Every structure is written in structure tokens, then in C-alpha cells.
């Protein structure tokens, strides 16, 4: 799942976003750009649950 | 004074050997999976298409 903080950019990412996992059949295969990704953790992080 | 292009045949392309016109390749399935029914589970099946 995507973090609580959106982005923008060509593979814009909404709050809590879920993941489409992938699979055997191949229409296309499926990512997520990583910067993103983590900028949406980015402020979550917490050092009681470190 | 006259340059240009010039073809030779290598010798070894000339020798004849074997007769094997036809084969048949098995290819190894990368999933362990039943024998294919229809053409995309065959696709999907293989280690790699060729």
C-alpha cells in the first residue's frame, strides 16, 4: 500500500493507494517509481517503532 | 589506383556434413504445471519462448 502523503508525477500515487500485485498472465507487468514511494512513508517513521 | 569491394567464399561454408533437414526441440517449463490445453497456457509455460 502507498503511504499517507500523495505525490504527483507521470505515475501519480493517492494516499493509502493499493498495489496491483502481479501475475503468470502478462498484459503488461506492473511498478511503482521508488522515490515516491518512499516520500509517501517518509513521515511516518518514528524512532519507538525503529 | 582502383579500389574497391571484394567477395570471397570461405572454404569451410562449402563442406558438406549431417542430413538432419527436420527436428523438434522440448523446451523445459519453468512452472510446475499440467501438460497446456490452449496456445497462452503454452506460452506462459515455457522457461523461454523461442
Given at each position: 500500500?502507498?503511504?499517507?502523503?500523495?505525490?504527483?508525477?507521470?505515475?501519480?500515487?493517492?494516499?493509502?493507494?493499493?498495489?496491483?500485485?502481479?501475475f503468470i498472465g502478462a498484459?503488461?507487468?506492473?511498478?511503482?517509481?521508488?522515490?515516491?514511494?518512499?516520500?509517501?512513508?517518509?513521515?511516518?517513521?518514528?524512532?519507538?517503532?525503529? | 589506383?582502383?579500389?574497391?569491394?571484394?567477395?570471397?567464399?570461405?572454404?569451410?561454408?562449402?563442406?558438406?556434413?549431417?542430413?538432419?533437414?527436420?527436428?523438434d526441440?522440448i523446451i523445459p517449463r519453468r512452472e510446475i504445471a499440467p501438460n497446456p490445453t490452449t496456445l497462452v497456457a503454452a506460452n506462459a509455460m515455457c522457461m523461454?519462448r523461442p
Amino acid at each position: 500500500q502507498a503511504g499517507p502523503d500523495a505525490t504527483a508525477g507521470a505515475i501519480p500515487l493517492a494516499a493509502g493507494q493499493l498495489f496491483n500485485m502481479n501475475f503468470i498472465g502478462a498484459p503488461a507487468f506492473e511498478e511503482w517509481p521508488m522515490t515516491s514511494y518512499l516520500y509517501s512513508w517518509a513521515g511516518r517513521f518514528d524512532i519507538t517503532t525503529i | 589506383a582502383n579500389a574497391g569491394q571484394q567477395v570471397f567464399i570461405p572454404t569451410q561454408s562449402t563442406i558438406h556434413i549431417g542430413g538432419r533437414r527436420v527436428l523438434d526441440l522440448i523446451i523445459p517449463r519453468r512452472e510446475i504445471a499440467p501438460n497446456p490445453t490452449t496456445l497462452v497456457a503454452a506460452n506462459a509455460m515455457c522457461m523461454v519462448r523461442p
